[PDB]
Each structure stands twice: as C-alpha cells, then as structure tokens.
RNA sequence: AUCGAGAGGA
DNA sequence: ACGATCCTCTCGAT
C-alpha cells in the first residue's frame, strides 16, 4: 500500500494556494523559488542549443536558468559548484536539467483525490511570491477554497510523459466531465455575483469604460460595437459588452417560469450568433449547469475556445465589478419593522397550535393515526407545526429584502446563500434536533434544570424562536449547540465511512476497461457489459435531449 | 522569500525601456504602447486626456497583473493622425494644466493666513 | 488663469482643505495618489546597532526608527544613494544620526526622537531633523530603558518614496469628495426607507446647490470641483505636498514625452 | 439609405417593475386600430408618461467600429430625441390579418403588431429606433 | 494471433489514447535529433513538430490493437482517421 | 495555555454528543474537530 | 402515491393511487395475495428480490436502489457509472459484495487481492496452491513498475 | 421525455438556421423523398460496431434504437418543412453533421471505466451529510456490503 | 454566610434554576422590538438562580464577541483557532528559552470585549489586532 | 510593547502622543473619548491606534537584568 | 481569521493608493469578500464591526458580551449620532480611478487574529534528493527535503486518465528504480551479478 | 536516520 | 477485519 502502489516521488512540490483572477483557467502560478528547484531533463538539439546554452549560463539561481548537465558517459556536471560551470560548451546529445519554465505542462492536484479532476495538467506560469496561483473556475473540480488549503504539483520527466499530460489530462479537456455528463467547472463568487448585476436591464455603460472593457477582453476584434442607445448619450448595456466575451456561433434558448420572447422579468435566456438577446445572466446560464453557456461553448467551439471563455468572461465582468463595487453588512439582515411584527406573531400562532394540540392530546381526545403511537403522532405534529412556522417567518422575511439587499442580491445570482440562510439570519432560526428528534430529556423528565419536569412545549425542547440577528437565549444557545455538535460529529464520521467506500468501489472495478471490440471486460477477460453504458457512448459526449414522440395528446402527436 | 524588491516598482531593470510601441494588428492606425514601471496614476490620466482629442477613435488601458507594475495603452486615431502624436499632445496638455494648477494653488496659498 | 483652479478654505502647518475645480476626475485622483505615494522624502533606511540592552529587539527598534519623521524640505538637493557615485553612502546622498541612551536613573529613562543627533555634514541644506510637533518637544517615543540598559545606534537616512516603503510617505491622510449631493448619480445609495434620511449630509453640500425636485437627470454632466484636504506628517509643509505632488506628477508625465523623443 | 416604418403612438401604460432607469411602455397606435406597441425605454434619459403622443420610426441607416463626434456637423437622423439600435430576432404570426415582430436593443425589448409591414420591415440585424417629442 | 488487413472490425478512427502515445513517441524521437519528415513552418518543440507530422500523415508508426483473446489488428497512422 | 490547563479527555453509548447535563459544567462549544471531537472537553 | 398515466385523449395525467408501504419484508408470500398487482410489488431489499424473481431483476433493484441513494440528495450520476457497478456486482449470477468476502475472491491474480485487506493471507493460500498471475491487472503492473493495459497501454506501437 | 443522448440535434438545426441564412418566407427545395429517405439513410451510417455478422449486426441495431427514435421524431417531414424551413442544402448538411458527431460520441477503447465509475460514485458520496427510511452513506454502505440485516426493510404494494 | 452553593450534575437533577435573577423574580403586573424574545419566569419553585449564563462557556469560547448571534459550529471553530493566534503569551517571553515562541509586535486589546475577558486577562495579553476592515468585492483577489 | 510610531491605516504619526494621552486621562480627569480628540486624533483609524494599545513594555522593564 | 470561525489567507497586498478609500481619507487595512457571509451565518462578525466602529469613535469599550440587551439598533442609533450611516456602510472611492463606487460598503474596525502556519514555513519543494536506505524511496518531511506522497488515491486518478506511461514514470523513474537479475528457470533474484 | 505517543493544518 | 487523504511538527527511548 505505501511503497509499491503509493510511493514518495521526486520532482514534486507543495504550498498554499490562492486565487488569481488574471491567470488563465488552465494555467497555474508557480512561485519562482519552486520553479528554480523542480527541473526538466531536456536533450540538446539544434532546434534549441541557443536557449539551452543561454540558460546553462544563467545558472541555478536566476530563473530562466538550470542545474546539472548530463553527458554521453552518464556524468553529472553540477552547475552550482564546478570550476567549469562558467565554461561548458553544450554538445548535441547531452542533457540539460533545466528549471521549470513558462508553459510547461504540470500535474496539479489537491487531496483527497477522489476524481480525475482532482489531478489536472496546467500550463506553468512562473510568478513572484510563494503560493500556487490558480484560476477560480478550477476551484470546484479540486474542491479547494483559499482558507489555507495546500496543493501538490508533479513534473513530467519524459517527452512522452509530458504529451500524456497535455493531451489527456489538460484542464481544458476536463471542463465537461463524464460523471455528471455535464460540465464540472462554472463561474463563481465575484464573477458570478457581478455578471448578474452587469446584466440587469437597468445596467448601462459608457464610452471610457466600454473602451476599457473591450480592450480588457484579449481576443477583442477591436471593433467597437454600436451602442444600444445613440440618443442624448451613446450608452451600451451590460449584455452588450459581455457578449463580446461570448464567441460567434453560440446559440442558447432557455425559458424559466415566466419567460415569453419579451421576458417582462428579464427571464430565461436567448443567445444568438454569440449575442445575448434577452435574459439576466446568472448561475443557470453561466453556472456549471447542463444547458449552460459552458456546456454549449465546449461542445461547439472546442475545449480550448471554451477554456478561454472563462478568463474573458472573468476579465470583463471582474473589471466591471472592480469599479461598481459590492458589499454586505448587518443592515442587509434587518427586516421591515411591521414585518418582524408579522413574523413574531407568525410564530405566536405556531406556539398556540402546539399548545392546542398538546391540551387535546392530554385529554386523550386525540385519534392516533395507524401505525403510530398517539405519542408519535403528537410529536410529529408539533415538529411539523414548528417547521412551517420557521419557514413562513422566513418567507415573510425574504419578501422584504429589496432587490438592493446584498444578501438577497447574492442569492439571486446564485453566488452564495439560500432561503434558509436568510430565514435564519433574519427571522426565526428554528427547531434544533439531535438524532432526528427534538432535544431530549438528559435530565429527569426535563431538558435543563431551568424547566419543570414534563414540559414538551417548544421552548423547552429545542425550538430556537429568535434569529441570529436578535440573538439566542442561554437555553436556545445550549440547544442550538447540541445540534451544532451532532453536526460536527457525523461530519467527522461521514468522511471516513465515505472515504472507505470510495476505495472498495475503486478496487472492485479498478481493472475494468472498454476493450477494442467495444466490449467491457476486466483483467480476466470476463465480459461485464457487451457494450459500455449499454450504448458504447462516452459519458462526456452526452446531453439531456427530449424525445418529442412520447408526450402530448394523441391529437397533438398527429397535428 | 519569493517577494520581489520594492524598487522594481519604479526602477527599470536591464533590457526594460519606458515604452514599447507595437502596431496593433486588429484595427488600422492602431498602436499598443506598453509602459514599464508605471501604474494607474499615469495610465488612467493619459487615457482620460487621450479621450479629449476628437481625432481619437479609441483609448483604453490595463494593468494586466497587479504583481507587476506596467500597463498597456491602446490608441487608434483618425487616418493621417499618428497616435504617437496623439500621445505627445496629451502628455503636454496634461503638463500645461498641471503647471497651471501649480501656480493658481501657490497664488491662493499665499493669500492665506496661518 | 488657465484651466485647473484652487480655493483654499482652511490652512495650517498640517492641513489644507481646498477646492480644486475645473479639472478631470482622472487628474484629481492622479494628483491625490502621487501625493500619497511618489513625493520623495528623507527617512532612516539603515540602522547600525552597537548596543541594545533594551527590552525591545534590534530590528523592532530599527523599524520604529525608520518610521520616525525627518525634515525633508531640501530633499530635492540630496541624491538617491543608488545614484551617488560613492561606495554605499556619503554626505551627498545621506544623513547619519546617532542615538545613544543609557538607563541612568532608577526612574525609567525614555528615549525620544529628539535624541537623534545629526553627525554628518548637512552641507547647509534643511534636511534630516527629527521632526517635533510635541507640546513638550519630545518627538515620538522610541524606547524606554531600565536601571542600567544601553542603546547605542547609528542610522543612515536616505531619500525614498512611499512606494518602496510607507515610512517615506509625507502625506498621512487625504480627504476627497465630489458631487456631495448625488446629482451625478455616480452611486446608488443603500436604504431601508429614505436614502436621504438614513445617509448623512457632507459639509461639502453647503458649498453646492441642491437637486431641484422635478429636474430631469443631467446625463451629460461630468465631475468638476473636488473637496480635498491634505494632512501632513510634517517632513514637508502642507503647501509643498500639494506642490511637489503637482510637480512630481508633472515630471512623471514629462519623462514619457522625453521617452518618445529618445525613441 | 432607407426608412422602414413611421407611426404616432398613444401611450396607455408605463411600467417600472423594479428598475429605476427603465420602464416598459405599451402605447396603442393612432389611425389603424390593428397596430399596438410594447417597448423598453430608458426613462432616465427619455421620460414618458400617462397618455403621450409618441412618434416612432424604424429604418436601418443614419458594421465598422463606432465613432462619435465630428459628424456633429455631418449626418443627423437627429430629427428625434430618443434613439436606439438593435438586432431583431423573431417574426411571428399573431394569426388572422395581423403579424408581429421582436427586436432587442441590447436587452431593451420591443414587440410590434400589424400587417402591411411584411415589406417595410427588414429581416436582419440592422434596425434603429427613432422617437421624437 | 494476427488478423488479415481484411475482416478488420476495429475503429477506423484513432483513439485519443493512441494518438497521445503516438504523439509522445514521435515527439520523443524528434527530441533525439531524429529526421523530420515534415517542413517546419518555423516549429521548434518536438511535440509541436510531431503533431504536424501527424497532421500531414507522415509518421511511420503502426498501432497493434490486441483484442481480448490474444489476437490483434495492425493499423497504420496513415490509415487511421484523426477527427477528435 | 489557560485552555490547555482546563482540558478533559475521555478514552475509548453516545459520548461525543453535547449532553443536557453538561450545561453549566463543560463548555458547549470548545472541542476539537473530527478525530477526538466530543471526547476532549474543556471545563 | 403520484403516478403519471396516459389519458384516453393522449396526454399524461396524474391519477393518484393507493399504495401500501410496509414495515417488514416477506416478498414470496405477498405477491400471491389477491387484490395487489403482483406485477408491480416492490422492495428495497434487493437480496429478497433476487431469491424470488431471479438475478436479472435483482440487478435492476440493486441499481434502482443505489440510484435513489444518490438522487435523494438531488445529485445525479450518469447511468453507465452505477450500471457498471451493479453489473460487476451481478455478473457472477449472485449478489457479490464490494467487501472482501466478495470481489477479492473473484478468480483474479494474487497481486490484485494483495492490494486490499488480506494481503499476507491471500499471498499464502496463493503460494500453497501455485497460482499463476497473468500480470494483466493494472494493480500488478503498478507493483512491477511497468506500463499497463490503460489508455496508453492497450495498443502496442511499432515501426 | 428528457433523456441524455449523444448529439444535441436541436443545436445542429439552429446551427443551420443561420449558417445558410434560412428565410421562413420562401419555399424549400426539399423533396419529400429527400427528407424521408435521407433521414432513413442517416440511420445506416451511425454505427458503433462493424462486424459483418448477424449477432453483432443486431447488437449495433440495439445500441442505436433510442437515439434513432430521437432522430426520427426530430427529423420528420412536417417538422423539417413546417417547423424549421430547411433547404436541401442546410438539411443535407445537418445529416452529414449528425453522423460525424455521433461517431465522435463513441467511447474509446482504453477508457478505464472501472475506475471512472468507482470515483463517479465515491465523490458525490462524500458530498452527502444530513420521511423515515435509511438513506445516505449508511444505506449506501448497507447496499455495497450486501447486508442482510437492513434497518429499513419495507415492501411497497400496489 | 450561605449565599451560594456548589452543585454537581447529580444534585442539579433536584433543583429549579432561574437564569437572570431580576428578569425572573418580579411579579407580572411596550416591549422593545429589537431585543430578542424570552419566555417567562413561570415557577413558584426556584431554589437557585444562575450566577450568569455567560458562565456556561469556558476560556476559548469566552473570547468570542456575541457568540449568541452566531451559528453553532462557527463558535467551535473559533475556539479551536484562538489557540493558533499570536500575541504575548507571557510578559517574560524574553527570559524563557523554549522551542519556538511567536509574539505580536503591537498587540491590541479588542474594541469588542466580553465581561468575561477581564478574568481571562485578555486585555492585558491580547492576541490579535484591531484592523479597519472592508467587506467588499475589489480586485477580485 | 510601546506606542506604535504612526498609524497602520493612514500614517498619522501617533507615537508622540502616548504620554500626552495618558496625562489627559489621569490628571485632566477626562474620558478616553475626548482625550483622543484633543490630541488631534479625529478619525477611527487613528483612534484605535492609541485607544487599543496595551503598553506592555512597562511590564517588561520590571525584569531586573 | 476574525473571531467568528472565518479564516483566510492573504491573496495580495495593495498599497494605500490602489486601495478603495473613504471620503474622510480612511482606507482599509484588510478587505474580505462579501461572499464569505450569507452561508456561514456568522452575523456577530458583522455586529462586532458595527460595535467596534462606534466604540473607536466614542472611545468607549464595546461590550459584545453574550446574553445582554445590546441591540443592533441601540448601536446603529449610537453610530448615527456620530455622523455615520447607522449600519456600517460608507460611500467609498476606487483607488485606481478616484471615482465613487456604485455600491456603498460595510466599513469598520474588526478584531483580527494572525494565525500561525505561514506559507514560507510550508513551501516545501523537492527534485530528487535523499532516499530511504531501506526502500530506496524518497524520505518524509520537508525538514529533510523529502518527497510528496503520490499515494494510492493519486494513482487511481492517473489510471482514470488512461495515462499509462506517466504512471510508470511516477512509480519508478522517480523514487524506486532498481535493476535486478533473474534466473530464466526459477524466476528468483538468485543470479550472482559479476559485471566485468 | 528506525521505532512508539500525544498536538495541529485542509 | 476494516476504518479518509496528505500534511508539518513536538516529546520520549535498547
Ligand atoms: O476548511 P475546511 O477543512 O473545509 C474544507 C476541507 O478539507 C477536507 N477535510 C477537512 C477537515 C477534516 O477533518 N477532513 C477533511 O477531509 C474536507 O473536504 C473539508 O471540506 O472546513 P470548514 O471550516 O468546515 O470549511 P468551510 O465550510 O469552507 O468554512
Ligand atoms: Mg472554508
Ligand atoms: Mg477547507
Ligand atoms: Zn553618496
Ligand atoms: Zn489613522
Ligand atoms: Zn535459479
């Protein structure tokens, strides 16, 4: 396990990572020092000597330099010590272990590596400071974030080896992943949160910026497009310029709930000839979804073209946002005065319901549903009653939130946040729960020594009425804490148990592959599938299409 | 340990000239002037002035990466008008206004008590 | 006179609130930045420690020294060591100060910047003088000593700028506002009910006329008039930060002009 | 070097659905009851209101990088106040003796309903929208 | 156990993995000062070259496709179609 | 240092769960993640 | 339960139907019960579905199951993937676990089994009964540091 | 009716709708024979297997049945003519197009599906962490182990 | 003088405990809408009253400001990080020779304190600085 | 550990105001708030600088050698 | 990290100018992304800022003690009396441009910790150094200039990428690599190598 | 450098 | 019988 199938290899490097918005999706920022260490055995050839000799002269401590020079006999001339290190006339056939340079292909991975996407080839980009720098939209496949994660880099040593990385494991090649048969890299955080704003109908840009944004897109055809407006002031819309990022020949229809080729809600999406016609741009369009502008652009224009799509969209949108700004504060969690009123009482009735059930139950009037203890039915009710309460006070809060509310503002982009977050931060937090049940009687017949024995009322058993804003009460605190813990714990568990499963699966199938007769057999040769996936079709090259012959009335099938 | 010396922010190194002028290839009468060891302060000021000249069809700029202190000014001018001239003018018009401000300030500063 | 024109409101040894009008925002800014980062100044940029029986570390003390503000008016006639043809430094490109302090009394002896002692030949130029605005005249508290603690230093102050290091900034803090009422609509205020009752009102509004209810949106207007104020560490008199600022920026520009030429 | 549609419209409703610089206007046509209009207009640059007499024009003239002034003393299809440019996408059969069309001005939308336009209305990108008084 | 050039059932099209190994192996030969059967429009990197030796079907390499029984089929890089 | 000196360890039905009776005696929050979570407590 | 159903007019409609969920299993005897539609009776206990309806059915449920685990989480996974699993779990005519008791016994070379839970032992009972490893498993060529029948090592290259 | 199948036909169409600038005002130059016989013929050149024998020739038919269904429902006479006014040229292109794409959507011998799958299930599994049944990890574990002591058994009758 | 007692979890079983003394022993004879909601002092039985709920916490969590306006687990994380923070762990760090010591140049007492930091000597040996922060999308870095 | 020379944030020299500040507290019997403003420390970047400082050196000096 | 379970590494430093600024001329020492807030529901953080701001202003120690009657209102009420927007927002201008930022920002002081574990203390990076005597495999740890673990899991990925050659090169040419002589009759490493 | 115990990072 | 990856470091002993 740790010596034969898993070894400690040479030419490896590891450090902290951080995002870099001006780096291409498929690159990776390698801190100068690391590059000065990792090397690559390049043989001397008339197509290079000049560069090679020049580097050998640069020596092991100036970047585009090298270490070691290998000769016919198999001797190692160490370039940092060697009366003759400032001499050395390179000879065709020799080897010059050179530093890692720009554009080299390298295998970059984050652990745990439970994917192919966890290990991908990136074009090297030597840069200052000491953290691997990576494009944000390469974030998710490796499941990284920049709170401290470290990442490992490996350097191909053989000319073949390199080829194997640049032709099979390159980040471009991996955008549309076979597992979910959809893409596995979208657009996040700022670029996402922003792109949306930048898109709003209400969003217009003028000359000075437009000209910068355009220039900002590297592949710009330098042809300023005519303003959406030419009247009193020539103004362009957001869509207008973003569309510059989208290449030609890309088409995309959408239709969300209320769409209607006039989408009064600037809904759905309509992109023709690489020009965005209607619809705000957010997660559904640019996310890593199935229909996505990415799934389409990869399939249509090519992996690389789509690789670029990322940086472009980013460079533009990022810049635009760099100048529009965006933020959040407590303010964003405060709800309309009359609202908190409507909310607080929204709960006030939930409690009365629970209370009214309770008294009913205690009168033995309750009718126990089949298969459940009158006791079970009781609990289930209250829990339902309280959940709804939370959810409505929550909904109640979500409506106030003005389109200008930054939290809501991110939720709409789909860049962070969800009902729940709002609902808890703004209105009632909720009913705490341990082991699928509302807080237990750790003490005799009671929850804490601050309650009287036998007390199934909501407060007593873990219903945190307050919001994270208003603040919890000791009891609430403690309770919410109990659940908190239950979470952290199975958190530690759901990790190991899964880690194990991840392996048993991997060992079990390990050796199964699609042979040359389109069959699927394991080492023994024992056929497992006569045609892979039953259609001998590769998962990545697939997409959800509609079989227009199944639905519709018999009349419509005919019409 | 991988940090670059601060002075590399304003001191040209070896083989680095304050400007490089390559002819843009996409448009006509277009030129991409790269500036070395210069940041937003200049870049944006010159971009703004360059946009006062009515014979200027385009003018934007960008610091491609914060790490490094250099930027690119792009310029496209009316047939027969050399952007380099469009650049010259701009820098001047800029200096002039500057001088002006220098004076007028110094004037006022002197009528002041304290 | 020509374009760009000022209107000082306040003025003193440290501040200069003034209105800069009929200029481009681009410039108002370029100016602002430059003030913050490219005006030269003298500051200790090398400390030779002989003895430090103190409670503080050498480099910890050295750091603070660097931060101590030094006179810099005649800095324009002091060279950059990197340009002086001397080996290392001299009296043409530096200013050497000595610090010697001994814990004498059993009552804690304090060490102020007023104790630095210029050793080099100033060559009759106002340069490198522990700047002191204290009331009691003890510019900055460098360090404190105990019974018999020693501190024997020798610093070499050099010409530098906020860019290599912030210790070299003469500016401190620069206020800057434009279009006090959001007539220009360069922002969209965040509100809970009335963005006008929730968001304060800047002094600068008083110096400008309101928006006039039913008036349409002025879609052609740009940013004229800026209400700034330059605070000054003091190595340079406030008037100068503004001037030298304007100067420097102006030179920066000129050097590109000079560039094309040599091209 | 043409013009493709002229017509005065009477604005019946002006809707600002959670936008502060845009309103979706719906004005009926004076003359031919058959014709109706749905449009997105920047109420910040060009206010509008309850029952206005709007003059509309389409055309496709007065695609090479955009330039700005100079011609401020040249061409001038500036006989109007408000003007937009766009790309039309779908032509639809409102059915009956009526037909409609859809244009997108960088997101600002417009749907036009009538019939004699089968000829006067283009079939391509080009399409300016001119409005006056 | 061989299979005549006829009765050939394997994919006419070259697999990615095949081309990545072909590309690698030729790129490697090119890196070892080996004759180049193409005209360089100014290329220097072995791989980049080898890519262009394939784009002009001038790579004297043949792929031997073993079936799962033991037999196989020899296909030449000249035959194999390179869509991808 | 304070926190180390006020630490608690529990070797080896549900023991890492924060438990009712813990109120007042052991800190409801302070506890290491994963590995010994809930086992190492802090008074 | 909710069940879409073709309406006489053609469109699929929603014709809710009563369904009994159970808290205990005994398939063999319930189908036979009258009134129920033995065509649809189901159980999440694939094993039982195996013993009663045959293995081809078992495979079905086995997937129907796994699937639900993964989709109840909103998450999707292309068929093929899980398919392969289930099938690999279902080719040996029985229900072979992903545990050691199942696939390491498999008929494979010694070395593969080596890389999983019962190395020592597996190698002994392997030495005792002179096993011959083809060396065609990826896991073994990894142990011998040689290329394997992977993308790059399935086809051979020649002059 | 929404199932993942190779070749997004809808797209190819749209990619003809404007690559040949097709006007929905003039009539097509398509022969009913063209379409109908063309669509049919297309179905002959998809292929996933190439043996000349019965058995394999029948597998090949199976592995294409569905897609073809998609294909037929999409490329139907009315549709081609009434839904998206193709022309002998556009249409003729759309076909040549599908073929190629299809052929591109086939798996490549070498593709290590064993692992590729194992991981495709293990990953989304390590994303699981939480109406009274045994689900999530535990259950998945229950399954993979082929346990006999499942906690939430149940029989669902209709 | 018997004004307090030492109770262990076992005896805790047999007692009734009021949280705040005040807010829990006045007779019920308008309410600030921004204050959280608390139930009531329903109990003619109280035998004890909590010295102060904030005491249910311990050293680490004690330094969290408003941990009662924070999602449960985030409080646990912070408690684990306060132990990786830098600052002056002891005024005599200079006279102690030990494997690694990290000290902050200019430690600052937090503008936001806890009535329980006075005992944890935090303000005297702070670990952290009071930086002017801005939550905002800037260079996208 | 001693009063920071100059404010992290804006750069306003501050190290020459510690003793002044202290006096304003002890003898002038003023509240930290005004004491600050009188010393010319008007913005919060420059107010936390002094207000928060914990002059530890005074405790390091009690260590004899 | 703040004091609310929110850690983060620096990603770049900007000098005063390039930084966004307050009309007062105040500039931030640190900038965090709004996106690290909705989900972590770490509201206190926000609050603490509101408080710490008011506090620094009025030279009052801010009391963020748990169970108290301290409201976000009472505080916002205090901060306004101090001439600032009651929530923490403050118009800010973009350092590059000097123009105003279309979106006001949450600006205030917040206690931040400097955690140990600093990049430079981690940056290990080896290119064939010392190897273990027992396995002839690269050594552990960076203090020793060892190698990174290309364990089981990484291998599976490579296998999944179908990159056979690379794999061999990783599990051999780098780390274990050894030449052994074998008996063509009893495949045992029992062949005496006398090379000469 | 082997070896065993705890602490910590994601 | 098994149990998650990779990681850095600290203490102590025949
Ligand atoms: O920062 P954090 O660890 O989040 C990311 C991950 O590393 C992997 N991991 C962490 C801890 C552990 O015990 N075991 C692991 O395998 C997990 O993929 C983590 O996801 O943890 P949090 O602070 O909880 O992360 P966040 O929710 O981003 O604040
Ligand atoms: Mg995190
Ligand atoms: Mg993490
Ligand atoms: Zn000199
Ligand atoms: Zn300050
Ligand atoms: Zn032998």
PDB file of C-alpha atoms (C1' of nucleotides) and ligand atoms in Angstrom, chain A residues 110 143-149, chain K residues 7 40, chain L residues 9-10, ligand 3:
ATOM      1  CA  UNK A 110      -5.473  18.677  -4.328  1.00  0.00           C
ATOM      2  CA  UNK A 143     -12.786  21.217  -4.286  1.00  0.00           C
ATOM      3  CA  UNK A 144     -10.487  23.866  -2.963  1.00  0.00           C
ATOM      4  CA  UNK A 145     -11.098  27.245  -1.412  1.00  0.00           C
ATOM      5  CA  UNK A 146      -8.436  29.586  -0.118  1.00  0.00           C
ATOM      6  CA  UNK A 147      -8.769  29.347   3.669  1.00  0.00           C
ATOM      7  CA  UNK A 148      -5.447  27.551   3.835  1.00  0.00           C
ATOM      8  CA  UNK A 149      -5.584  24.506   1.555  1.00  0.00           C
TER       9      UNK A 149
ATOM     10  CA  UNK K   7     -10.153  32.059   8.362  1.00  0.00           C
ATOM     11  CA  UNK K  40     -21.655  30.869   7.364  1.00  0.00           C
TER      12      UNK K  40
ATOM     13  C1'   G L   9      -3.322  22.252   9.167  1.00  0.00           C
ATOM     14  C1'   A L  10      -7.420  21.163   4.965  1.00  0.00           C
TER      15        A L  10
HETATM   16 MG1  LIG N   3     -11.168  23.693   3.919  1.00  0.00          MG
END
